[PDB]
Amino acid sequence: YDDHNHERYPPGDPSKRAFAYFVLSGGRFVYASVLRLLVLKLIVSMSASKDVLALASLEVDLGSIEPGTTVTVKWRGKPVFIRRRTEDDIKLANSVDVGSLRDPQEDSVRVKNPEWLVVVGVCTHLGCIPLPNAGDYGGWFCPCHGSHYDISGRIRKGPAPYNLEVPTYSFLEENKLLI
Amino acid sequence: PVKLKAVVYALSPFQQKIMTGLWKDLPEKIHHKVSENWISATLLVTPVVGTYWYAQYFKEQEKLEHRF
Amino acid sequence: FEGFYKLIMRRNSVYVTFIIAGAFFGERAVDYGVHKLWERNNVGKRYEDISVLGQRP
Amino acid sequence: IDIQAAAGWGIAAAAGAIWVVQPFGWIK
Amino acid sequence: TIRNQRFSLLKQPISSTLNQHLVDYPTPSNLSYWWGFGSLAGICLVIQIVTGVFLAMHYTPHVDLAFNSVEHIMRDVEGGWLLRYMHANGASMFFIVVYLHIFRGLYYASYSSPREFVWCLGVVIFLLMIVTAFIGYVLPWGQMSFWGATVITSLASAIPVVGDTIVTWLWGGFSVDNATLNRFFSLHYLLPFILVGASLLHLAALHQYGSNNPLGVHSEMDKIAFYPYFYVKDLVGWVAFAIFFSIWIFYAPNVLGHPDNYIPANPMSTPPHIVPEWYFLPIYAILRSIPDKAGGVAAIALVFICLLALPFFKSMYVRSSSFRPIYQGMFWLLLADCLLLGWIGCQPVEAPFVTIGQISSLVFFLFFAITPILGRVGRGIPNSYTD
Amino acid sequence: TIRNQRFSLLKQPISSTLNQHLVDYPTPSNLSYWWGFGSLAGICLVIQIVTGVFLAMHYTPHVDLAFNSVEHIMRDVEGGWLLRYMHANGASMFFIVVYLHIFRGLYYASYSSPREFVWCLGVVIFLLMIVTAFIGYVLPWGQMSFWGATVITSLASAIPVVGDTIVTWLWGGFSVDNATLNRFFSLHYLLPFILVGASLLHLAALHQYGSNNPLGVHSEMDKIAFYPYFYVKDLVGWVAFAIFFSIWIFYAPNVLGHPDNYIPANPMSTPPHIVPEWYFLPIYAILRSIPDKAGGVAAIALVFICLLALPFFKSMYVRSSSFRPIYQGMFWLLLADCLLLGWIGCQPVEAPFVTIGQISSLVFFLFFAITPILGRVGRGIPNSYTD
Amino acid sequence: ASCHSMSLISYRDLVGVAYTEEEAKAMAAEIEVVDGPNDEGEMFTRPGKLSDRLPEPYSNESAARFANGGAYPPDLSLVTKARHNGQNYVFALLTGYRDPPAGISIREGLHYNPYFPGGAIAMPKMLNDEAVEYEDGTPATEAQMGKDVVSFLSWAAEPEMEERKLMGFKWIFLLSLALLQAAYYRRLKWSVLKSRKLVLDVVN
Amino acid sequence: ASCHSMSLISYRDLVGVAYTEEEAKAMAAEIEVVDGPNDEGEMFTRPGKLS
Ligand SMILES: CCCCCCCCCCCCCCCCCC(=O)O[C@@H](COC(=O)CCCCCCCCCCCCCCC)COP(=O)(O)OC[C@H](O)CO
Ligand code: HEM
Ligand code: HEM
Ligand code: HEM
Ligand code: HEM
Ligand code: HEM
Ligand SMILES: COC1=C(OC)C(=O)C(C/C=C(\C)CC/C=C(\C)CC/C=C(\C)CC/C=C(/C)CCC=C(C)C)=C(C)C1=O
Ligand code: FES
């Protein structure tokens, strides 16, 4: 055998196969790590940018409206619903069986005031904004897939699995509501 | 297909040393590299280095001759 | 000892698991050592080594 | 060679999932 | 023969691959005009790529400029109106041609062995087309664009544990915003090229065995060269398609669209009627027929699962509907059902359309459930219908 | 053999072409590490495409936002600085690996028969690489981007009749402005896919005859399979390239460029030192050397004419510089001359650099002028050097 | 900041680098930022937040030029990356105002600086002893202030330097290990070919 | 126009459709368009133009 490039092991010597797996496993560690790093860098570059995450916290104030209408207000990219309900409205909203609801919750829990109903106005199904004064329950209707919300914002018909989310809020004296 | 006649003996990769050959015959390896390639190395290095040094000398002379 | 050393050489699934584990642990160990020596080489220059860190006025 | 191989490759896949995604904190 | 000298330049190594794949490729002599829609779809893809490359010279993927950049393409750049109407209605032409192509494949059972890989690559191509067209429709940044992007990126939330993180990763934030639009632009430039590659693979898989024919029989005894016969037939088809497309471009450029996308995107107000483009409406209907998030997404995935599993059903050895009366009738019922699903997708979600959509979705899945039963039973036809 | 049963999966129709063109393709056993730069070029192309696609998700092609969007990538995108530096330095890496590839071809006369078409495709690929990298450098919209765009788009003004018309058509107006940037961005997404196709055609043309070898002889009697031998040989070069690239990315990210591109574009003022990237420096020196605009453009085009005409010159039958000492010396002189031209391009236009550049361009062209006469003279070597 | 803007930097960028969250919050709250429109359609001002950028000293470029003799003080966000030898150049120009060489007259409104190209700068010398009061107590000498401000400018231009360096050390060590492995792999695969004995009949 | 914008239409658009060039020029001159900033750095006003 030519020995300019490689010198043989003495005849009658056991194979170096098991030594060679160990040297090779060594560099395969690094190859796998490099693949993982590059792929994860590419994937995480699509995650939210530092400036996007910067604008993710703030609160605003509000005023007042007529007894029976709603006005949408603004946040991050998300509307917020306000609806001061009447006495017969509360009677309607306090006569629904909790068991029959797919998300059992009473109106009293959701509201911090007997008549002022404040709730994030984004459909829990796929993100559309539910149209007010529409539906089969006098609450809201989401046009996108037919999700019906009652006056308290509880889902009653459609694909949506949750009721409209109540955010943290409070009053100041009578007409200044902090969300 | 070319008609070939030859005898080839080969040894298994797991019966030979893999890396020691890098550092064997090292003086021969250096001597061959230098002796076969010194003309090429000269033909590549001389014009670049000469042109660079001449440009530097030209710039120094031009800078000095514009002073007071 | 011999059990794992016989599984790794005889089943490629075990060898691939061994490669994945080695990548994970080796990359963490180098990240750790590289940060230790970085901390040793930059004593006092850290954000939390600022003496007045916390009193802007 | 069929059930043992399936178990081994499932173990390898689970380990690779734990290695690529590292949710150390989702053990809750 | 010994190739010492040069014969036809077509047989030289410079041109031999093109010659054997496009000029001399053996083709069944009895192919009808329903076999020209593959070339039509390829032409639609090239038209979309050319018009989109030229339109990307003038479009600005920013929420503050995208709508205005479209309007500037329409009003300011010379022939801009033509370039835009051609891209926007060429998407519709692409989908019309591809739908006709798919239903040709369904009628003549072109998915059956040995052409299963052709059908699977076609299904992958259809998925790529859907994604490409949707993210393209987001780019004008009208009301339709914003709200459709909202719901489609929200689809990922159907996954219980990691669904929200996928939605927020797709958005690049907590809402559909400039990051969404910019990433959708890059994807829109990229996906057409992957579509071209997938179409080439589709064609190579088809030339492994050659095209199926209206009789569904072995065709090796009566094949003819693609050039010139099927070239001139496809040319008749190309000119007719050009007349059709020109009618859409010059006289009805906005009939296959909704006026809502001429209103700039308003993240505050969802429009009262919110629908995708017409070529997505059947999938919309199947989605809305399930009164459940995860159920709807799973039905959408099951549509493509059934399309992919179709070629691997143990079937009878007869392909063409021309010799399969029951399967032929079922195919026509499936076509009617698909048209009904498209029409239902355009309707508000209320009575009687919920029941009609549910029944139509059931019929659509019954097609794919019943075809294997038909194959198993019809395997016994030659033993029961004796001469 | 009658292939009734399935043998090795690689020989099945699903992977036969990848087995024959990529796995089992015969390769001369004596190929050196200089033959590993084509694969490096391909990996550089892939790196550029992937990083650019993910960079385009955050870049805005508008004059009021391009610079700021590039800074927003550096600063706000998680992993953004690494995407940018990999892409910017990746471009320099592509040019290094491609220059080494080209000079490997020149030293071993790889352009000679029968592989002339390979060389011509390579030249077309080099042109595409130059256009792609130039228009890409304009996207940041810094000082260097704007003034470099102002010159190369004015090169058409060398044409007497339609030159000004061509300049104003390429600009999209009467100056370098937003229209120029938008059209550059569109061209810059599209050109790399044309580069991918051209590379595929390049590799196919080469595989018609197989690779030349360092001895320059017929190699059929000692060919081996590409996998795994030249796979592992190429992997060594890939890992070394990764180390080199990582050094540039992590420790010297901006030493390959100029600080002037970090200044936002100013059409009023002009940087006193307006240079291109280093990989265009030799071309730019050859253009500046001629004291006439039209003559300069003609010289630039003559460079590529000389490159394209090299394979077709009647020559001697010996290929390798290993057996052509005079051609070997010419090659080393040419390499020194190209390095000199690159250095001269970075020098301001002032003595003594003007004359040095003129002499250097003259020597560059003398290489191509003198190679054919050497071939004609050396055809008589076997008669003259007898036994 | 009286005449230079740093428009690529925001108050949130300083957190975890030189100040705490509360310190940067109060610093931002000490400035006024134009916001709006309100519900009535009118612009207004409000205290700054962490996400707000550093305030600009001038409304526009022309207003900057008018207040500085027609010369525009460039944005300093990338100044150290935007000049050759940026850190050293800025330090030397900041600490390099001195009397001009004999035979050199500087027109009114300019000041001589040999490090500045042309030699005549429109920026006056403003790094002077005790120009700043340091909360940590270190003497605010001219060289101290110049060094500190160049350090701040270096960070502002290259805020990713430390993570990037920490990545380059780890990955070059790992890739060098991989290169050793790859060399062993190539040589092991090729040894059967390199050590082979070839027997032929030909001689010459 | 006292309540609705037509932000996509320029005065040049009317030329050759409903007005001569001089007619649209005088029309635009009738309105006050903001412009600047000037050399001193202030926003000012100018007569409207066809563009
Ligand atoms: C989208 C899915 C739809 C779901 C539908 C719900 C379940 C129904 C599934 C059955 C499909 C409904 C349509 C089936 C009837 C098709 C019409 C038909 O076949 O009538 C033929 C009449 O002959 C028949 O086929 C009647 C047979 C009745 C069924 C007998 C079943 C026994 C055979 C079982 C074989 C199973 C496999 C058969 C493969 C074809 C047509 O005769 P002709 O066209 O040759 O000429 C007459 C005409 O006037 C001129 O065109
Ligand atoms: C690489 C090729 C392509 C490029 C560069 C491209 C580019 C663009 C651009 C810039 C727009 C925005 C301008 C506009 O709305 O008119 C757009 C919109 C669109 N593109 Fe594409 N496109 C390409 C291929 C395709 C393909 C293959 C399809 C269909 C599958 C498609 C479908 C659409 C659709 C539906 C729109 C929205 C049209 C509208 O209502 O205005 N594009 N494209
Ligand atoms: C961009 C989209 C597509 C292009 C460019 C394309 C192209 C082609 C072409 C040129 C042919 C051969 C000529 C013809 O039969 O018309 C063909 C055949 C075929 N295609 Fe496609 N196709 C596309 C999409 C699809 C889809 C979505 C499917 C199914 C899901 C599909 C399934 C088939 C089948 C089964 C055949 C074989 C037809 C037969 O032999 O009768 N293709 N395609
Ligand atoms: C995108 C850039 C390019 C890629 C990816 C590329 C790729 C390749 C590959 C993979 C090979 C076969 C393996 C090898 O010897 O390296 C090759 C061979 C070759 N390439 Fe390229 N190439 C490129 C550009 C060029 C250019 C610009 C030229 C010259 C003008 C050129 C001329 C050649 C020649 C002559 C060969 C045959 C070499 C021989 O057999 O010795 N290539 N190329
Ligand atoms: C389809 C593939 C590609 C896409 C989508 C793409 C996209 C981009 C984008 C968005 C930029 C601007 C951001 C930045 O400058 O960092 C850019 C810059 C650049 N690209 Fe590409 N690119 C691609 C391929 C290439 C290729 C193949 C080359 C090399 C020939 C190249 C060379 C450059 C250069 C030199 C710059 C300027 C980098 C700088 O200094 O900032 N790109 N590219
Ligand atoms: C210590 C605080 C300051 C630093 C670190 C600083 C830094 C710089 C730098 C690096 C330049 C650019 C030099 C070049 O072109 O290469 C510059 C230019 C300039 N600076 Fe400042 N500067 C400071 C304070 C000021 C102040 C307070 C003023 C105004 C009173 C000012 C006005 C200018 C002007 C007008 C220029 C343009 C000069 C010219 O083109 O000639 N700077 N400064
Ligand atoms: C038997 O043979 C033949 C057929 O019957 C099976 C055919 O159906 C057709 C007609 C239909 C074809 C070939 C459709 C091809 C469709 C595709 C791949 C869609 C997109 C088309 C592009 C971009 C072509 C891509 C090819 C290349 C090489 C890229 C470079 C080309 C350009 C720059 C335009 C032809 C011509 C044919 O003869
Ligand atoms: S988004 Fe509201 S029901 Fe679908």
Residue numbers in the entry:
A (entry chain N): 93 to 271
B (entry chain Q): 5 to 72
C (entry chain S): 13 to 69
D (entry chain T): 18 to 45
E (entry chain C), F (entry chain M): 2 to 388
G (entry chain O): 104 to 307
H (entry chain E): 104 to 154
The publication says:
Our 2 Å structure now shows the bound, co-purified Q substrate in each of the two Qo sites of the complex III dimer and surrounding water molecules in close-to-atomic detail. Both Rieske head domains assume the b-state, with the Rieske FeS cluster positioned 6.8 Å away from the bound Qo, and the FeS-coordinating H237 of the Rieske domain interacting with the Qo head group via a 2.9 Å hydrogen bond. In this distal binding position relative to haem bL, electrons can easily pass from Qo to the Rieske iron–sulphur cluster in the course of the Q cycle. During the cycle, protons from the quinol are released to the cristae lumen. In our structure, as in the stigmatellin- and HHDBT-bound yeast complex, one proton can be directly transferred to H237 of the Rieske head domain. The second proton can escape via a short chain of water molecules to Cyt b H259 and then to the cristae lumen. An alternative, longer path would lead via Cyt b Y280 and the bL propionate group to a water cluster surrounded by conserved polar residues of Cyt b (R85, Y86, N90, N255, Y263 and N262). Either pathway would enable proton release to the bulk solvent without involving Cyt b E278 in the Qo motif. However, in the Arabidopsis supercomplex, E278 does not interact with Qo and only contributes to a water chain via its backbone nitrogen atom.
